[PDB]
Amino acid sequence: PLKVALVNIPLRVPGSDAWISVPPQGYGGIQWVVANLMDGLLELGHEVFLLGAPGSPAGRPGLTVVPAGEPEEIERWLRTADVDVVHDHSGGVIGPAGLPPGTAFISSHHFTTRPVNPVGCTYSSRAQRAHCGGGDDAPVIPIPVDPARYRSAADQVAKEDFLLFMGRVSPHKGALEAAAFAHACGRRLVLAGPAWEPEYFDEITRRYGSTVEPIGEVGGERRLDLLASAHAVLAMSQAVTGPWGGIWCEPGATVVSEAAVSGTPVVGTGNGCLAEIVPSVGEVVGYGTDFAPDEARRTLAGLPASDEVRRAAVRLWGHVTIAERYVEQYRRLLAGATWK
Numbered sequence: 001p002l003k004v005a006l007v008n009i010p011l012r013v014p015g016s017d018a019w020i021s022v023p024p025q026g027y028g029g030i031q032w033v034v035a036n037l038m039d040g041l042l043e044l045g046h047e048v049f050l051l052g053a054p055g056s057p058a059g060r061p062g063l064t065v066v067p068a069g070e071p072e073e074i075e076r077w078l079r080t081a082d083v084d085v086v087h088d089h090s091g092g093v094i095g096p097a098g099l100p101p102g103t104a105f106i107s108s109h110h111f112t113t114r115p116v117n118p119v120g121c122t123y124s125s126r127a128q129r130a131h132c133g134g135g136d137d138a139p140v141i142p143i144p145v146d147p148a149r150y151r152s153a154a155d156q157v158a159k160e161d162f163l164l165f166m167g168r169v170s171p172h173k174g175a176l177e178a179a180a181f182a183h184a185c186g187r188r189l190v191l192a193g194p195a196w197e198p199e200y201f202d203e204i205t206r207r208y209g210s211t212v213e214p215i216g217e218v219g220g221e222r223r224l225d226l227l228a229s230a231h232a233v234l235a236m237s238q239a240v241t242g243p244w245g246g247i248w249c250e251p252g253a254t255v256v257s258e259a260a261v262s263g264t265p266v267v268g269t270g271n272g273c274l275a276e277i278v279p280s281v282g283e284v285v286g287y288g289t290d291f292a293p294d295e296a297r298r299t300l301a302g303l304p305a306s307d308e309v310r311r312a313a314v315r316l317w318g319h320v321t322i323a324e325r326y327v328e329q330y331r332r333l334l335a336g337a338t339w340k
Contacts, residue, residue: 001045002330003083008034008052009090009110010069019069021056023149026219027168027194029254030110034089037108038063039146040323049083052090085330092116104333106326108141109134112249112272118340120333122326124252125273131249137339139329142277144322145257145313151228153263153306162188162213163300164230164264166223166255169195169204169214172248174236174269176200179208180289181234181267184296187211189234192218192226224262232303233259235268235278238287250274256281260313263306267299280316281309 009030011020020028023035031053038048042062050056051066051074058065068074071093078086079098088094088107095117096105107121114132115121122139123129129140151157163182169175169191182189191214195201204212218226227233237250250272259266259281266282268274278284282303285291304312315321 001047002085002327003047003049004041004330005049005051005066005078005081005083005086006034006038006041007074007086007088007090007094008050010052010071010074010093019052019054022050022053023056024219026217029167030089032254032258033108033110033143033252036144036146036149036319037089037323037326039148040144040319040321041326043320044323044327046327049081051077052093084334087326087330088117096120104330106329106333110251112244112246112251119338121340122329125250125276127249127272127275128251131246131272135340139325139339141322141325141329142273142317143252143254143257144319145261145317146319147261147310147314150258150262151224153310155228157225157228157263159231160229161231162190162229163267164190164192164226164233164259165236166192166218166226166233166258167235168193169201170197171200172238172240172242174234174238174271176204176207177238177269177287177289178234178236179204179212181236181285181291181296183208183211184291184293185300186293186297187231187300188213190215190226190230192216192223227258227262227264230259230264232282232300233264233266235259235266235274237269237271237274239271248272253277257313257317260309261317263310265303265305265309267303277316280312 022031024031047062049064054067054069056065068077085104109115165178167173194217256277268278270284
C-alpha cells in the first residue's frame with residue numbers, strides 16, 4: 001500500500017480567502033480530476049494525503065486532508081513527509097527538489113502549455129502529449145471518472161430537450177459555436193459555467209439569444225442533474241490562440257467523461273483530446289459556426305443512448321482502471337525508471 005501525496009492546484013474561491021476544495025464547490029476541472037483520481041486510489045487500498053485543498057471533505061478512511069493551501073506550505077510539508085509518491089496536478093507549483101530520498105515525483109499535466117516538470121510527466125491525451133513536447137515514453141492516461149459521484153441509471157433522471165454547455169464561457173471553449181450548433185438543431189442550449197468575458201457573452205446573446213439560456217457557474221447537486229438530464233453535451237473547444245501562447249489544444253476535457261458516465265452523449269469538435277474521446281461517446285463535428293441544420297439535427301438524433309455512453313465511460317475512464325494505471329507509473333518510478 002502506497003502513501004500518495006496528491007497535490008491539487010492551489011486556487012482561492014474567486015473574491016475570497018478560502019481555498020477551492022476537492023471536489024470543488026463550484027467551477028474547477030482539475031479539482032474534479034483529483035477527486036475522481038483520489039476515489040480510485042483509496043478504493044485500491046492506498047493512503048492519500050491531499051494537498052492544496054484545505055477544508056475539503058475529509059471523512060474517507062485512508063484520506064488525510066493536509067492543512068496546506070499555499071505553495072510554500074505545500075513545499076514545507078512535502079520536504080518532511082513520509083510518502084512514497086508526490087503526484088502533482090498543479091502544473092508545477094511544486095517540483096521534485098527537496099523531496100526526501102526515496103520519494104517518487106510524478107505529474108498529471110492539465111494544461112495546453114508545456115510543463116514546468118517534464119520528467120515524470122503524464123498527459124491526458126496523445127494530442128496534448130505531442131503539443132506539449134512530451135516524449136514517446138511519457139504515459140498517456142485520460143481523465144478518470146467515479147460513477148458513484150454521478151447520477152446512475154437507477155436515479156432515473158428524466159431526459160430534457162435542452163443541449164448543455166458546461167465550462168467557462170470563453171472563445172477557445174467554443175460557447176459561441178455550441179450556441180450555433182444548438183441553433184442549427186432547433187434546440188435550447190443551457191450555458192452552465194462562469195461567463196466572465198462580457199463582450200464574448202454579449203456576442204453570443206446578440207447572435208443566439210433565443211437559443212441560449214445562460215445560468216452562470218453551477219455546482220453541487222444541480223450540476224449533476226444537468227449532466228444527466230441534458231439531451232447532449234457540447235464540447236466545442238476551438239483551435240484559436242490566446243494568453244496561453246500558441247494554438248489552444250484541449251488537454252483532457254473532463255466534461256466528456258462526466259457527461260457520458262451520467263448517461264449523456266457528447267457532440268464535440270476534434271480539438272486536442274476531443275478527437276480521441278468524443279467518438280467513444282458521440283460524434284465529432286467541424287470547427288466554426290456554419291452548421292447545416294439537416295446534418296446537425298441528424299448528428300444529434302443519431303447519438304448513442306445512455307447505457308452505451310455510461311459503459312464506454314466506465315470501461316475507458318473508470319476511476320479504478322485509471323487509478324491502477326497511475327499506480328503502475330508510480331511503481332515504474334519507484335523501481336528507478338524515468339522518462340520525459
